[PDB]
């Protein structure tokens, strides 16, 4: 059961890293820069589901 809380903790950490890129992009004033940062964050987070599932699967 504790695995989830480890996974959840990391997943929000990763979100905060991705978000931090989006906002930096935003402060640029350039929408394209924000979109480039957003696509990276979406794809990263999708990929991150797969890692967590593997870790959950292997442990379940």
């Amino acid at each position: 059961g504790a695995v989830f809380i480890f996974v959840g903790a990391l997943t929000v950490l990763f979100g905060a890293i991705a978000y931090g890129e989006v906002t930096a992009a935003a402060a640029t004033g350039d929408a394209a820069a924000v979109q480039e940062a957003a696509v990276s964050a979406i794809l990263g987070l999708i990929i991150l589901l797969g890692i967590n599932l593997g870790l959950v699967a292997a442990t379940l």
């Binding site: 890293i17 890129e21 990263g44 991150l48 699967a57 292997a58």
Partner: protein
């Protein structure tokens, strides 16, 4: 920050290393090789992450940045992971040289491809991918057959470790394609973060699951 992520990698790998050296202190008569191997897997990786965290080995390639230490890590540690899995499975030597060679081809192809600006990097990726399917076939096929002959506790630990490996190693080539070496949809920072997470699970997580079962 890139170097912060590298430093978190180094610290994670270190903790794992110290954990495996400690746990190994009271290892059985033919179990030391397992503990030695895990100290090898996480210790090499720790040194690599330290090197990257210190800013060394950042190679310019076209419009991307390739971290040479990352790949030198993989070439050394991934076959050690395969050696570990070969131990639970109970391979003889011949079966080792096949899978290890397959594995080595994967990492070299990824590395080579990573270092090539041209579109032919995808051909190199192609070959790495084909070798990977070869490796997977051995993990789920013959090595699994081998592992079935062993005591059920070892079989169950094998399946558990094989599942974790096959599933998570299959994610790497996607990071390669979506990240800087491929279409550059993942920023360098996200690429590094995902790999750090993977490297910790495939090595340290892999290891702890083995500590859990060597007890239980």
């Amino acid at each position: 920050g890139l170097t912060t992520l590298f430093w978190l990698g180094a610290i994670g790998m270190l903790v794992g290393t110290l954990a495996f050296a400690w746990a190994g202190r009271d290892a059985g008569s033919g179990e030391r090789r397992y503990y030695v191997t895990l100290v090898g897997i996480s210790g090499i990786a720790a040194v690599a992450y330290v090197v990257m965290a210190l800013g060394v080995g950042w190679v310019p390639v076209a419009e991307r940045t390739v971290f040479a230490p990352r790949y030198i890590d993989w070439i050394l540690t991934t076959p050690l992971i395969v050696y570990f899995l070969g131990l639970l499975a109970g391979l003889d030597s011949r079966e080792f040289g096949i899978v290890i060679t397959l594995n080595t081809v994967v990492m070299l192809a990824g590395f080579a491809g990573a270092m090539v600006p041209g579109i032919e990097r995808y051909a190199l990726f192609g070959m790495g991918a084909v070798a990977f399917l070869g490796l997977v076939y051995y993990l789920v096929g013959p090595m699994t057959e081998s592992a079935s002959q062993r005591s059920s506790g070892i079989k169950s630990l094998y399946v558990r470790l094989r599942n974790l490996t096959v599933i998570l190693w299959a994610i790497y080539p996607f990071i390669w394609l979506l990240g800087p070496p491929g279409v550059a949809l993942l920023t360098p920072t996200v690429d590094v973060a995902l790999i750090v997470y993977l490297d910790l699970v495939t090595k340290v997580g892999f290891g702890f699951i083995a500590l859990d079962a060597a007890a239980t």
